[PDB]
Amino acid sequence: TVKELLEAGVHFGHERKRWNPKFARYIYAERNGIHIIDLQKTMEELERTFRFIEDLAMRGGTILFVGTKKQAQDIVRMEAERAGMPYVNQRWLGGMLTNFKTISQRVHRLEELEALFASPEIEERPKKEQVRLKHELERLQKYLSGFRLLKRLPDAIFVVDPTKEAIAVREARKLFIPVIALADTDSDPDLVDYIIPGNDDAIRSIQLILSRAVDLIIQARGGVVEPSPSYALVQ
Amino acid sequence: DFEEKMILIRRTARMQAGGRRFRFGALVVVGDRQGRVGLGFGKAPEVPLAVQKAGYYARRNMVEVPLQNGTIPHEIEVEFGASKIVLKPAAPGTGVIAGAVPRAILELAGVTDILTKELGSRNPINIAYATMEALRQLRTKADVERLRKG
Amino acid sequence: GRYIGPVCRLCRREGVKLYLKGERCYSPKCAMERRPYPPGQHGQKRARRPSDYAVRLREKQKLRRIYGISERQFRNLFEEASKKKGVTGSVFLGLLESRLDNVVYRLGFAVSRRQARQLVRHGHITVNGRRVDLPSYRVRPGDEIAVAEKSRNLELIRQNLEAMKGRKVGPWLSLDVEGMKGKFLRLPDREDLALPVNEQLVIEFYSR
Amino acid sequence: MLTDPIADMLTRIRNATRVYKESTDVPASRFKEEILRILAREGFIKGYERVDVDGKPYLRVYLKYGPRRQGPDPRPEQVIHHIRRISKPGRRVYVGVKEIPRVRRGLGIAILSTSKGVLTDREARKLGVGGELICEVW
RNA sequence: UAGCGCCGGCCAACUCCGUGCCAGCAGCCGCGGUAAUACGGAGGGCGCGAGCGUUACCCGGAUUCACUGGGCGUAAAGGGCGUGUAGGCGGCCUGGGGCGUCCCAUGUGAAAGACCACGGCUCAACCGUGGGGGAGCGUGGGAUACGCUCAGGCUAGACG
RNA sequence: CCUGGUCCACCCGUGACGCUGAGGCGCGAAAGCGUGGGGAGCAAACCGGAUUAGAUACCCGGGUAGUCCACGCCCUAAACGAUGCGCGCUAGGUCUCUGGGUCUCCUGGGGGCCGAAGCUAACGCGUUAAGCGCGCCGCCUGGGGAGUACGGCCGCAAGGC
Ligand SMILES: [K+]
Ligand SMILES: [K+]
Ligand SMILES: [K+]
Ligand SMILES: [K+]
Ligand SMILES: [K+]
Ligand SMILES: [K+]
Ligand SMILES: [K+]
Ligand SMILES: [Mg+2]
Ligand SMILES: [Mg+2]
Ligand SMILES: [Mg+2]
Ligand SMILES: [Mg+2]
Ligand SMILES: [Mg+2]
Ligand SMILES: [Mg+2]
Ligand SMILES: [Mg+2]
Ligand SMILES: [Mg+2]
Ligand SMILES: [Mg+2]
Ligand SMILES: [Mg+2]
Ligand SMILES: [Mg+2]
Ligand SMILES: [Mg+2]
Ligand SMILES: [Mg+2]
Ligand SMILES: [Mg+2]
Ligand SMILES: [Mg+2]
Ligand SMILES: [Mg+2]
Ligand SMILES: [Mg+2]
Ligand SMILES: [Mg+2]
Ligand SMILES: [Mg+2]
Ligand SMILES: [Mg+2]
Ligand SMILES: [Mg+2]
Ligand SMILES: [Mg+2]
Ligand SMILES: [Mg+2]
Ligand SMILES: [Mg+2]
Ligand SMILES: [Mg+2]
Ligand SMILES: [Mg+2]
Ligand SMILES: [Mg+2]
Ligand SMILES: [Mg+2]
Ligand SMILES: [Mg+2]
Ligand SMILES: [Mg+2]
Ligand SMILES: [Mg+2]
Ligand SMILES: [Mg+2]
Ligand SMILES: [Mg+2]
Ligand SMILES: [Mg+2]
Ligand SMILES: [Mg+2]
Ligand SMILES: [Mg+2]
Ligand SMILES: [Mg+2]
Ligand SMILES: [Mg+2]
Ligand SMILES: [Mg+2]
Ligand SMILES: [Mg+2]
Ligand SMILES: [Mg+2]
Ligand SMILES: [Mg+2]
Ligand SMILES: [Mg+2]
Ligand SMILES: [Mg+2]
Ligand SMILES: [Mg+2]
Ligand SMILES: [Mg+2]
Ligand SMILES: [Mg+2]
Ligand SMILES: [Mg+2]
Ligand SMILES: [Mg+2]
Ligand SMILES: [Mg+2]
Ligand SMILES: [Mg+2]
Ligand SMILES: [Mg+2]
Ligand SMILES: [Mg+2]
Ligand SMILES: [Mg+2]
Ligand SMILES: [Mg+2]
Ligand SMILES: [Mg+2]
Ligand SMILES: [Mg+2]
Ligand SMILES: [Mg+2]
Ligand SMILES: [Mg+2]
Ligand SMILES: [Mg+2]
Ligand SMILES: [Mg+2]
Ligand SMILES: [Mg+2]
Ligand SMILES: [Mg+2]
Ligand SMILES: [Mg+2]
Ligand SMILES: [Mg+2]
Ligand SMILES: [Mg+2]
Ligand SMILES: [Mg+2]
Ligand SMILES: [Mg+2]
Ligand SMILES: [Zn+2]
């Protein structure tokens, strides 16, 4: 909540090409063939975005974090592994929201196989199944790791790159689910309800924004949590 | 609570090695006659499953109609594909004057007197979609002044 | 022509109990009480989902066969109502109810509308004093429909007006039983009629 | 050159609103300005103002839109859903006072050019004069 | 006195027998070559009814000559290309005229018909009375935003 | 050598002198016609060899008109972007031709590809519009009959409109 001057590395955008003209309002200028985000409008939108986040958090709402850019995977896997908001990390399966019932059936199979490997029924029905179901539970935990926490449809979603995760954005629009997103120059701002005009490539921007967001979430529900152990993931 | 009536039921066919294989498509309108309508198009290997699926899709796609004394507030003209729909309000005592598709759609919406005309393509699917978009493009004087507040 | 022939077959075909014989459509002998299916060899067979034209045509045929009016006069009355200002359906119903034979039936002078037609056609009915023998005569608000003084000694009128003791008449009608007369107070509203017919379906039928 | 400056302005407004622009510049003229007065008075635009481009005077029309909508296509509802020129060069349309159209059964406007100035449908009907049916907007 | 058409879909009304791409039906799609709701007959049904059908013709549906109200990349349809005559169309500002445009008053718009109201033949058809209308054109007066014209000015089009 | 078109920079000059365009007039690939010339290669017709059931073809060996030039005719076409001309408006990215400039790049004109909004029946089009508009010309109104018949105009004829 004090990220005014500590925003080191967020103003960096993508190149001159691969941009979206609809983002021109959130751009300050172009330095050395690279779009640089407007520093003022960044916090201008951050006010309203974080205010919506606090309102939805203190009401007890669930937010789905979505990240697949391979630069925010290890960060989302723990910033959402804090206060119990679910997440999707490896890839966004088509129909996680519109076909939410079938994916919940997949989650049922996940916890069923978890109950099988907890019961003494592991050894019966010989080793063929002990390998098949082992690999099946492996991949189910690989994909539905954070998604298993959703019992109903989420009240909002959080996206790291709305261009790379455009399918989740589209499904959220279809179901009238608010779309919080960390938008860059390559993204369409109209599809994002609450926009965060920052960098989606640099690890520091993602760590800063997501850490402060989860800190605001836990601050809305009381019991301020220690700083997130995602700094060591700078590497 | 919800009234349901099918527009048309057709049997389409694909070609497979050995012969043609059929698939049934059905249009279904659902309405409470209070100002809410819904249009759905379901496809299933059998007819009853297609009718039920079209009913589900019709309940999923709803349109709020701003009725004013059982008629429409202002004349509309909608081009869906090559099909054109022309809606025009009428005084009470007239009745719903329309083709089968728009008559069913507007009657299930709660309309009692209106003057319509289908133009261009008479295709029941495109005419149904044109009538749905027409009802979706309806505005009231309240909505008009709401837009022009400034 | 007046369709003259079997009547309760229409009670069956129309699917709704009609009253074309007066009595015996109230007694368990209407053949609609015991045979509600349409007539013919294929009456008991499973009916197919009728078309919209089927629904509108059957509704209009119900409304027409209720009064026993030919298609010519029926279409003429409908066009006449559509020319007038006001709701086409309610004005049409008020016109049909204004027919002299239907007024005779409503005032209890005859048990059925066809018996009322025979009573009018044979000069047993007077309007404001003058004898009128036209079932298609239109009654105006304020006209006194009376029984012919020379006919008040007939057996049928004695029976009919002997059964009308204690019975009530429509809100738009008054009845003097001792003098064997009545008055047409006003045109009846749609709420006043208990007809099992949707008039908008008939309007849509003639909209084609 | 422009064969119909008024229709050119109306088309500029149409194409600008269809992409949700902020404002649009139209080559200035007293007729266009008297039309934009009616536009701003009726509420189809936030307003207009005279500006200067490199050497020539123009009119900046500040467009007006509705609130951002939900679901797919969050683009807001257009305040000017439809704007069409009627009395074009080569086929000019003149109407008497009893021949003035009621646009969308009252919800729209019809801009008339009459001997008493540029008015709307209701304004000209109240004044009691007809003239050239410039355009219709609703 | 009750008759006439229809009963595969459009289109309201289904069975039996005969026939076997024969005999035939048919407004359009089409039906008949062994078990035809389509032919022929019967029973039954549907629609009208002193009428019911057929044919012809007109308008309609037909937005299918598109003023309202259509089109031309591949469905019918951009001329092989240019120069350019008549014609059609005409950037910004001021003024005069008032031809187009608009407004007021007035005359004309016979009667019958059409519309509305009341009334006369027992109703109706038919008829009478009264009322209301109305585009267009003539005249007098007025308005000048736009189109027009004349006079002047400007440089964003055009040319140099 | 003679000559047309066109683009950019300066903001210099005229002061609406503009757009389109029924007729008219001119241009108009190839083939074809006339007169004269030329004629290496190619090559309709044709002369043969093969192939084939036959081969008036494809394949092979020859070969005339023609292709070429001058002058004069002919007016056709898948004469094609199967998209008339002009102007204004409406996201961009990339490739390229050609100017100008503070020469990473910007700006202007032209040729391509991908694509916003939008359009379209779809394919697809998308600042080179098939989008949004305006002006003007041409043309369409089911298929066959038929681009035929008659008539007219044009042409030496073939034939064309
Ligand atoms: K459209
Ligand atoms: K025979
Ligand atoms: K038969
Ligand atoms: K007209
Ligand atoms: K020679
Ligand atoms: K052509
Ligand atoms: K250069
Ligand atoms: Mg609404
Ligand atoms: Mg179309
Ligand atoms: Mg059509
Ligand atoms: Mg009426
Ligand atoms: Mg009427
Ligand atoms: Mg006039
Ligand atoms: Mg009206
Ligand atoms: Mg009012
Ligand atoms: Mg049927
Ligand atoms: Mg027959
Ligand atoms: Mg015929
Ligand atoms: Mg046999
Ligand atoms: Mg048989
Ligand atoms: Mg038969
Ligand atoms: Mg019979
Ligand atoms: Mg006849
Ligand atoms: Mg016809
Ligand atoms: Mg027509
Ligand atoms: Mg029409
Ligand atoms: Mg025709
Ligand atoms: Mg037209
Ligand atoms: Mg067309
Ligand atoms: Mg073509
Ligand atoms: Mg061309
Ligand atoms: Mg001229
Ligand atoms: Mg000229
Ligand atoms: Mg001018
Ligand atoms: Mg002129
Ligand atoms: Mg003046
Ligand atoms: Mg004048
Ligand atoms: Mg007269
Ligand atoms: Mg008269
Ligand atoms: Mg009378
Ligand atoms: Mg008058
Ligand atoms: Mg005058
Ligand atoms: Mg003056
Ligand atoms: Mg001048
Ligand atoms: Mg120059
Ligand atoms: Mg100068
Ligand atoms: Mg000068
Ligand atoms: Mg030219
Ligand atoms: Mg020419
Ligand atoms: Mg040539
Ligand atoms: Mg040649
Ligand atoms: Mg030669
Ligand atoms: Mg020679
Ligand atoms: Mg050779
Ligand atoms: Mg050879
Ligand atoms: Mg040979
Ligand atoms: Mg052979
Ligand atoms: Mg041989
Ligand atoms: Mg020769
Ligand atoms: Mg080509
Ligand atoms: Mg071309
Ligand atoms: Mg072009
Ligand atoms: Mg370019
Ligand atoms: Mg493309
Ligand atoms: Mg699109
Ligand atoms: Mg596509
Ligand atoms: Mg263009
Ligand atoms: Mg023909
Ligand atoms: Mg031909
Ligand atoms: Mg032809
Ligand atoms: Mg030819
Ligand atoms: Mg000839
Ligand atoms: Mg000759
Ligand atoms: Mg020859
Ligand atoms: Mg020829
Ligand atoms: Zn009965």
Swiss-Prot record, chain A:
Residues 99-144 form a coiled coil. The keyword Coiled coil applies. Gene3D superfamilies: Glucose-6-phosphate isomerase like protein, domain 1, Helix hairpin bin. Part of the 30S ribosomal subunit. Contacts protein S8 and may contact the N-terminus of Era. Spans the head-body hinge region of the 30S subunit. Is loosely associated with the 30S subunit. InterPro entries: Ribosomal_uS2, Ribosomal_uS2_bac/mit/plastid, Ribosomal_uS2_CS, Ribosomal_uS2_flav_dom_sf. SUPFAM superfamilies: Ribosomal protein S2. Disulfide bonds: none annotated. PANTHER family: 30S RIBOSOMAL PROTEIN S2 PROKARYOTIC AND ORGANELLAR, SMALL RIBOSOMAL SUBUNIT PROTEIN US2M. The lineage of its organism: Bacteria, Thermotogati, Deinococcota, Deinococci, Thermales. It comes from the Bacteria. GO terms for molecular function: rRNA binding; structural constituent of ribosome. This is Small ribosomal subunit protein uS2. The gene is rpsB.
Curated annotation (Swiss-Prot), chain B:
Disulfide bonds: none annotated. It holds the Pfam family Ribosomal_S5_C. Keywords: Ribonucleoprotein, Ribosomal protein, RNA-binding, rRNA-binding. GO terms for molecular function: rRNA binding; structural constituent of ribosome. Residues 2-65 form the S5 DRBM domain. GO terms for cellular component: small ribosomal subunit. GO terms for biological process: translation. Belongs to the universal ribosomal protein uS5 family. With S4 and S12 plays an important role in translational accuracy. Part of the 30S ribosomal subunit. Contacts proteins S4 and S8. The N-terminal domain interacts with the head of the 30S subunit; the C-terminal domain interacts with the body and contacts protein S4. The interaction surface between S4 and S5 is involved in control of translational fidelity. HAMAP family: Ribosomal_uS5_B. Is positioned such that it could physically interact with spectinomycin. This is Small ribosomal subunit protein uS5.
UniProtKB/Swiss-Prot annotation, chain C:
Pfam families: Ribosomal_S4, S4. Binds 1 zinc ion per subunit. In a number of structures (e.g. 4Y4O, 5FDV) a 4Fe-4S cluster is seen in place of the zinc cofactor. Keywords: Metal-binding, Ribonucleoprotein, Ribosomal protein, RNA-binding, rRNA-binding, Zinc. Transmembrane segments: none annotated. Coiled coil: none annotated. The keyword Nuclease does not apply. Residues 98-160 form the S4 RNA-binding domain. SMART domains: Ribosomal_S4, S4. GO terms for biological process: ribosomal small subunit biogenesis; translation. InterPro entries: Ribosomal_uS4, Ribosomal_uS4_bac-type, Ribosomal_uS4_CS, Ribosomal_uS4_N, S4_RNA-bd, S4_RNA-bd_sf. The keyword DNA-binding does not apply. Its cofactor is Zn(2+); [4Fe-4S] cluster. Zn(2+) binds at C8, C11, C25, C30. One of its GO terms (cellular component) is small ribosomal subunit. GO terms for molecular function: metal ion binding; rRNA binding; structural constituent of ribosome. It comes from the Bacteria. Belongs to the universal ribosomal protein uS4 family. Part of the 30S ribosomal subunit. Contacts protein S5. The interaction surface between S4 and S5 is involved in control of translational fidelity. One of the primary rRNA binding proteins, it binds directly to 16S rRNA where it helps nucleate assembly of the body and platform of the 30S subunit. Binds mRNA in the 70S ribosome, positioning it for translation. This is Small ribosomal subunit protein uS4. It comes from Thermus thermophilus (strain ATCC 27634 / DSM 579 / HB8). The gene is rpsD.
Swiss-Prot record, chain D:
It comes from the Bacteria. One of the primary rRNA binding proteins, it binds directly to 16S rRNA where it helps nucleate assembly of the platform of the 30S subunit central domain. The combined cluster of proteins S8, S12 and S17 appears to hold together the shoulder and platform of the 30S subunit. GO terms for cellular component: ribonucleoprotein complex; ribosome. The lineage of its organism: Bacteria, Thermotogati, Deinococcota, Deinococci, Thermales. GO terms for biological process: translation. This is Small ribosomal subunit protein uS8. Keywords: Ribonucleoprotein, Ribosomal protein, RNA-binding, rRNA-binding. Part of the 30S ribosomal subunit. Contacts proteins S2, S5 and S12.
